[PDB]
């Protein structure tokens, strides 16, 4: 939709959601394994695992149906291997080491994390703010190597291996309408 | 009782058995407006019915015409009513003409009122099932000869029972209106009963039982010690959130005026002291020297005010306050902090409250004055939760300038000796004078009434008299009059308080209204305020003087 | 929604051309148009924002009598508050009469 | 698509489309299998959710009897409902974008369609109701412009699809605007069929592009996200090698 | 001796990096900001300074143009930490950063300021009547001997605490037999900063 040029890029709002339709492991609280009751049956999801699960044992769910039943009283999420300390450490450590190479970390960087310590604040091993700085602490290092990467801007390509959604999303228009122009001036020329 | 304190759980379950529904608001809340504990009661229930995902309305309402109006404008879809801070002490079967016959299917629609009241109307519990309220444990003990005579009354020699029992019934009426105990205290039970404690809880129902230490102090020392033990039951990082027993004294925003200040507005030492005059502000400052204050340091900020004698001030105060007596002014209360926002306590937060709702933002500017109240109230309701402190800080310096203007007031009162001493009752009027404007407000003319009745109290006299006060809006041409009942020192043994003392204006009022054609209207929730005309007041008063209270 | 909602943008119009107007009548029938055939089961004049969150609070705005809703009864009375599904409002959110989303 | 392996993968479909269409500079065909699919599921689902719900609706009213079950009855259909207005608002934000794409390059596809010998037709690209969305708001537009200005204009210049003189007024699609990239590989599991692809040191498969302009040639391998020209990448991308982001 | 201003140091940039509101680190994020844009000065609250830690507070209110410098040097490696980029080891022109607080204690005025308010922090206000031109004053002089003939740095703060707070010129040479203070001051290669004076009324 244009809505004041909408048409081009992606809002927050979308890339939440697009994040958010993200399967994710669960740790239930509540049983509804069959008589041997309603049938889930939905469109977009294997029911299979819905249908067929049993309290305290791990199972695999979308996010936002974890996310409404950690609104109720039925859900535990389980945190991934990134969200705690001893791994964080090596992830800085080694963006500390290589200064011209972008840390392997998935597209969903930084929104789970958003949306877990916004709902799941309680469930985690480690405090809370030991966290949040460390990720501030990646945020920052990510955003100075960003800076020193974007000095020279090519007309013809360019690489970046492992930008994240929002690192990406921020930075699509100004890099476009540059190269752009840029591109506009040498075929100009030719 | 109808429901006795263990058994409100049971209630609970049916209106999940009720109301709990998908796509259907089934459960409408009607709350006393202008009102604390109100308010709290209706937080914690609003919290509780979010948790398991029950849709819910909030209304508020100032008067019983109000009342009516919106019963009326209610569909037989409702299956549960809530009424809460109000409707305890009259019929309401009678009063919106429900008909028994018309709601069996039962009953149907149930209505639950929740009051404190303990005049409350002895029909509206043992006549009716359609209406079903929480007692507080009055029934079972104290309504226990009262009852007998209502089911009895519900061959010539007979006629001596029918004459106990209206004799039993008058004596159980004719009483004042007073109340004995907290909503949110009872909210509170029955969260503990069910398991669905909080620090938000616990931080709401101190709030409600703090709200009464002005005028129900032996209702606050009887709730204390369980605010206490609840409290006791359940490195400084950015998240802590720590309740405490910390020491603090009656005194107005003291941990956000100067101490100076403080001292200078807090109504007990203006009580003690007699700080209208020159003599009050001379003790003032000898008392401050005999500490050794300077009187530069005192009129500083609480934050940078110095540190060594922030620490020494409890051993300041312990070591000089005995000459002049004021040492009932250090109580033990509680303290909220959260990380590094800074701290607050249960008292400040509750005058930020009240002034907040004071002050913020013939028959129409009386429809637009009540509009404006509501909307007041769910301002002070959105200032609540933590994410908003620009709508405290706010309420804090408002609270500031009603207290000063309020003081300003009445020390001309106090100067032009407008108080007329008559041979029942105190009266005084307020014809004429500076921010006539602002005491439009029943809130505002109750504090008025209170910072004066303590100042009475605070004399030599020896006469426990009501206190009838008045004002004018000359737009339009009416006087608000509002009765107060005398108060004991703050100082004074429990063996003297078998019995609080009660209000007989409401049923005086309503007499006298009976009798007369006055013009007058009587909606207040509220029974002891009313609204009068200029030119009729003068002959009320003296119908007031000549009829027995 | 293709209404032009004369009754609450600009208020009288006038500042358009006739041309400018029985162009915009004429977007108008488009606009009813299109969502009467294949797609009638989804609102292509609807709101934007992804579906977040289920239950939400919403506080009145302005005043009316009582509207009726699937298996319910909203009433809307002056300055209240609602604790209702998502889904249902949104359609009043856009007319202005509800706030506090 | 000829046939599903799951309803998961029409809708995995139906958001790599949308995703591809908003951010695509030059409007793209019309899956038409895969949303006659979906609608004919919304319809049952919501017939369903419905019966469903009429019922309850139903036995709670002929008598008061006993209330559903709180468990295992609102949240079931809770999630169904959430989920398809979750469904409906992405489908609504594909179908306005695609109108919206439409309304800008109106006159360069009409003026291409009566083309004999383009042999991309306008059928394919649109659905009908885009068809007669396009026609009528084109002869709207012409008539309002004809009203207003045309009809004082010389006999020379009235027309509105001139292409001669100083400056043409058809709006091409820009083909070489730049758009992020991100190299998905071959659909197939095995990844490694494609007669296209080609390997490097340490092997890493990669397609080998080139580019006219520059006489260069641009080398792109499997998990490398890339910013590159739009005109370049066509054939990638109608082929699902690669996906936009 | 050192000892002291390293937990000082040390505390002041854990008060920087360890403060947060809600879920925003407000100091880190002005200190982007203000590199960003060349403003090399950074803005403290007193009552966050208050909140987080009362004995640093005291400690500023004791002793002001003791402790002041050390803020504003941890302000600088805070800023150097989080802007540059180690290299597994350049230009470096980062002076040392301007501290600039706001408050909001009682007003004191011009008259009342008498002999019991000296080294202290204070606040007023008034009217502003006269100006004076710019002036230079040095912060890195580069210093040079006759004799033995050798280059040596030093590092000037410009905050005073007894009248003096100068050393002019070291007493002897470094290490023969030069004279009491063999030294002149090479004017290149020195860094300036600018100052002014105000009259108030
Ligand atoms: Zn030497």
Same mark, same amino acid.
């Given at each position: 939709s244009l809505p004041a040029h909408l048409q081009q890029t992606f809002s927050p709002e979308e890339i939440q959601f697009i994040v958010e339709n993200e399967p994710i492991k669960i740790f239930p609280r509540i049983t509804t394994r069959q008589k041997i009751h309603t049938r889930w049956q939905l469109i977009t999801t294997d029911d299979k695992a819905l249908n067929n699960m049993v309290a305290m044992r791990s199972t695999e769910v979308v996010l936002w149906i974890a996310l409404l039943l950690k609104q109720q009283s039925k859900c535990s999420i389980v945190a991934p291997q990134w969200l705690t300390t001893k791994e964080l450490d090596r992830k800085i450590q080694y963006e500390k080491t290589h200064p011209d190479r972008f840390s392997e970390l998935p597209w969903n960087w930084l929104v789970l994390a958003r949306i877990l310590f916004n709902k799941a604040k309680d469930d985690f091993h480690d405090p809370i703010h030991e966290l949040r700085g460390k990720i501030q602490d990646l945020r920052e290092i990510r955003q100075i190597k960003v800076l020193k990467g974007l000095k020279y801007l090519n007309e013809s390509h360019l690489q970046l291996d492992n930008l994240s959604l929002l690192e990406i999303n921020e930075l699509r228009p100004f890099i476009t309408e540059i190269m752009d122009k840029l591109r506009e001036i040498h075929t100009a020329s030719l | 009782m109808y429901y006795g304190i263990s058994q409100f759980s049971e209630a609970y379950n049916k209106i999940l058995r009720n109301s709990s529904s998908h796509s259907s608001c089934q459960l409408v809340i009607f709350v006393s407006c202008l009102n604390i504990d109100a308010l709290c009661a209706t937080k914690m229930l609003s919290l509780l019915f979010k948790k398991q995902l029950?849709?819910?309305?909030?209304?508020?309402?100032?008067?019983?015409?109000?009342?009516?109006?919106?019963?009326?404008?209610?569909?037989?879809?409702?299956?549960?009513?809530?009424?809460?801070?109000?409707?305890?002490?009259?019929?309401?079967?009678?009063?919106?003409?429900?008909?028994?016959? $018309?709601?069996?299917?039962?009953?149907?629609?149930?209505?639950?009122?929740?009051?404190?009241?303990?005049?409350?109307?002895?029909?509206?519990?043992?006549?009716?099932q359609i209406i079903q309220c929480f007692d507080d444990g009055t029934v079972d003990d104290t309504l226990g000869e009262q009852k007998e005579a209502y089911y009895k009354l519900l061959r010539k020699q007979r006629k001596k029972q029918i004459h106990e029992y209206e004799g039993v019934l008058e004596e159980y009426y004719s009483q004042g209106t007073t109340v004995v105990n907290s909503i949110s205290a009872q909210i509170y039970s029955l969260l503990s009963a069910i398991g669905e404690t909080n620090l938000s809880n616990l931080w709401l129902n101190i709030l409600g039982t703090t709200s009464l230490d002005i005028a129900y102090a032996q209702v606050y020392n009887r709730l204390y010690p369980l605010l206490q033990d609840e409290v006791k039951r359940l490195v400084k990082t950015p998240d802590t959130l720590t309740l405490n027993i910390q020491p603090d004294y009656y005194l107005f925003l003291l941990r956000h005026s100067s101490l100076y200040d403080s001292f200078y507005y807090s109504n007990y030492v203006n009580a003690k002291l007699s700080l209208w005059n020159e003599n009050? &502000?001379?003790?003032?400052?000898?008392?401050?020297?005999?500490?050794?204050?300077?009187?530069?340091?005192?009129?500083?900020?609480?934050?940078?005010?110095?540190?060594?004698?922030?620490?020494?001030?409890?051993?300041?105060?312990? &070591?000089?306050?005995?000459?002049?007596?004021?040492?009932?002014?250090?109580?033990?209360?509680?303290?909220?902090?959260?990380?590094?926002?800074?701290?607050?306590?249960?008292?400040?937060?509750?005058?930020?409250?009240?002034?907040?709702?004071?002050?913020?933002?013939?028959?129409?500017? #009386?429809?637009? +004055?009540? &509009?404006?109240?509501?909307?007041?109230?769910?301002?002070?309701?959105? /200032?609540?939760?933590?994410?908003?402190?620009?709508?405290?800080?706010?309420?804090?310096?408002? /609270?500031?300038?009603?207290?000063?203007?309020?003081?300003?007031?009445?020390?001309?009162?106090?100067?032009?000796?407008?108080?007329?001493?008559?041979?029942?009752?105190?009266?005084?009027?307020?014809?004429?004078?500076?921010?006539?404007?602002?005491?439009?407000?029943?809130?505002? +003319?109750?504090?008025?009434?209170?910072?004066?009745?303590?100042?009475?109290?605070?004399?030599?006299?020896?006469? +426990?008299?009501?206190?009838?006060?008045?004002?004018?809006?000359?737009?339009?041409?009416?006087?608000?009059?509002?009765?107060?009942?005398?108060?004991?020192?703050?100082?004074?043994?429990?063996?003297?308080?078998?019995?609080?003392?009660?209000?007989?204006?409401?049923?005086?009022?309503?007499?006298?209204?009976?009798?007369?054609?006055?013009?007058?209207?009587?909606?207040?929730?509220?029974?002891?305020?009313?609204?009068?005309?200029? $030119?009729? #007041?003068?002959?009320? +008063?003296?119908?007031?003087? #000549?009829?027995?209270? | 929604n293709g209404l032009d909602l004369m009754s609450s943008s600009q208020q009288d119009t006038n500042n358009l051309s006739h041309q400018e107007q029985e162009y915009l009548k004429e977007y108008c029938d488009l606009i009813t148009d299109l969502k009467s055939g294949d797609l009638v089961d989804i609102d292509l004049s609807g709101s934007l924002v992804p579906p977040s969150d289920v239950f939400i609070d919403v506080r009145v705005l302005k005043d009316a009598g009582e509207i009726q809703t699937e298996y319910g009864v909203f009433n809307l009375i002056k300055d209240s508050q609602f604790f209702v599904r998502q889904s249902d409002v949104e359609r009043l959110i856009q007319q202005g009469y509800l706030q506090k989303i | 698509t000829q046939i599903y392996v799951s309803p998961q993968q029409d809708f995995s479909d139906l958001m790599k489309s949308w995703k591809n269409e908003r951010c695509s500079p030059e409007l793209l065909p019309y899956p038409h299998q895969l949303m006659k699919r979906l609608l004919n599921r919304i319809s049952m689902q919501s017939?369903?959710?419905?019966?469903?719900?009429?019922?309850?609706?139903?036995?709670?009213?002929?008598?008061?009897?006993?209330?559903?079950?709180?468990?295992?009855?609102?949240?079931?259909?809770?999630?169904?409902?959430?989920?398809?207005?979750? #469904?409906?608002?992405?489908?609504?934000?594909?179908?306005?974008?695609?109108? !919206?794409?439409?309304?800008?390059?109106?006159?360069?596809?009409?003026?291409?369609?009566?083309?004999?010998?383009?042999?991309? !037709?306008?059928?394919?690209?649109?659905?009908?109701?885009?068809?007669?969305?396009?026609?009528?708001?084109?002869?709207?537009?012409?008539?309002?412009?004809?009203?207003?200005?045309?009809?004082?204009?010389?006999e020379e210049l009235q027309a509105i699809n001139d292409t001669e003189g100083s400056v043409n007024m058809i709006d091409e699609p820009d083909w070489n605007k730049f758009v992020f990239i991100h190299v998905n590989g071959p659909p197939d599991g095995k990844w490694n069929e494609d007669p296209l692809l080609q390997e490097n040191e340490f092997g890493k498969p990669c397609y080998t592009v080139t580019i006219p302009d520059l006489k260069e040639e641009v080398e792109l391998t499997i998990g490398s996200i890339y910013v590159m020209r739009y005109e370049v990448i066509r054939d990638l991308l109608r082929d699902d090698k690669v996906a936009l982001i | 001796n050192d000892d002291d201003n390293t937990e000082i140091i040390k505390s002041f940039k854990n008060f920087i990096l360890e403060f947060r509101l809600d879920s925003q680190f407000i100091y880190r994020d002005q200190l982007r900001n203000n590199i960003l844009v060349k403003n090399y000065s950074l803005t403290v609250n007193m009552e966050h300074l208050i909140g987080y830690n009362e004995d640093i507070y005291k400690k500023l209110s004791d002793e002001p143009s003791d402790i002041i410098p050390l803020f504003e040097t941890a302000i600088t490696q805070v800023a150097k930490r989080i802007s540059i980029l180690s290299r597994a080891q350049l230009l470096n022109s980062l002076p040392t950063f301007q501290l600039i607080l706001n408050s909001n204690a009682n007003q004191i005025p011009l008259r009342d300021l008498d002999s019991e308010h000296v080294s202290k922090i204070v606040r007023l206000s008034g009217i502003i009547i006269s100006t004076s031109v710019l002036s230079s004053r040095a912060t890195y002089l580069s210093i040079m001997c006759r004799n033995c003939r050798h280059t040596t740095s030093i590092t000037i703060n410009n905050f005073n605490s007894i009248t003096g707070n100068t050393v002019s010129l070291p007493r002897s040479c470094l290490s023969k037999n030069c004279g009491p203070d063999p030294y002149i001051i090479i004017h290149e290669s020195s860094k300036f900063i600018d100052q002014q004076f105000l009259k108030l009324q």
């Open positions: - | 029950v849709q819910s309305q909030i209304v508020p309402i100032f008067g019983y015409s109000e009342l009516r109006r919106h019963y009326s404008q209610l569909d037989d879809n409702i299956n549960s009513l809530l009424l809460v801070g109000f409707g305890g002490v009259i019929d309401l079967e009678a009063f919106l003409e429900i008909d028994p016959q $018309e709601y069996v299917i039962s009953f149907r629609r149930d209505i639950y009122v929740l009051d404190a009241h303990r005049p409350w109307n002895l029909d509206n519990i043992f006549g009716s009050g &502000k001379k003790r003032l400052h000898k008392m401050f020297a005999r500490m050794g204050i300077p009187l530069s340091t005192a009129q500083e900020t609480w934050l940078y005010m110095d540190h060594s004698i922030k620490r020494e001030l409890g051993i300041i105060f312990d &070591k000089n306050l005995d000459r002049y007596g004021l040492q009932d002014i250090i109580r033990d209360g509680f303290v909220r902090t959260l990380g590094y926002r800074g701290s607050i306590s249960a008292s400040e937060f509750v005058e930020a409250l009240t002034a907040l709702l004071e002050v913020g933002n013939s028959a129409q500017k #009386l429809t637009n +004055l009540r &509009k404006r109240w509501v909307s007041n109230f769910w301002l002070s309701w959105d /200032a609540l939760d933590d994410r908003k402190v620009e709508l405290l800080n706010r309420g804090i310096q408002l /609270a500031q300038d009603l207290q000063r203007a309020i003081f300003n007031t009445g020390v001309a009162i106090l100067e032009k000796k407008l108080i007329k001493h008559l041979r029942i009752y105190r009266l005084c009027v307020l014809q004429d004078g500076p921010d006539l404007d602002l005491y439009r407000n029943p809130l505002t +003319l109750l504090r008025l009434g209170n910072w004066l009745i303590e100042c009475c109290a605070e004399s030599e006299d020896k006469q +426990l008299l009501p206190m009838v006060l008045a004002s004018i809006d000359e737009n339009t041409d009416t006087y608000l009059v509002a009765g107060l009942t005398p108060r004991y020192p703050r100082g004074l043994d429990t063996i003297h308080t078998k019995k609080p003392i009660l209000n007989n204006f409401s049923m005086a009022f309503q007499q006298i209204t009976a009798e007369t054609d006055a013009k007058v209207r009587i909606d207040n929730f509220e029974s002891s305020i009313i609204e009068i005309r200029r $030119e009729d #007041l003068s002959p009320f +008063l003296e119908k007031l003087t #000549l009829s027995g209270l | - | 017939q369903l959710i419905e019966n469903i719900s009429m019922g309850f609706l139903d036995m709670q009213n002929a008598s008061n009897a006993n209330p559903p079950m709180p468990n295992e009855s609102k949240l079931p259909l809770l999630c169904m409902e959430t989920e398809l207005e979750r #469904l409906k608002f992405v489908i609504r934000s594909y179908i306005r974008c695609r109108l !919206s794409k439409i309304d800008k390059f109106s006159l360069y596809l009409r003026q291409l369609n009566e083309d004999e010998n383009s042999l991309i !037709s306008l059928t394919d690209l649109l659905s009908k109701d885009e068809i007669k969305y396009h026609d009528t708001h084109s002869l709207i537009w012409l008539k309002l412009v004809n009203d207003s200005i045309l009809k004082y204009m010389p | -």
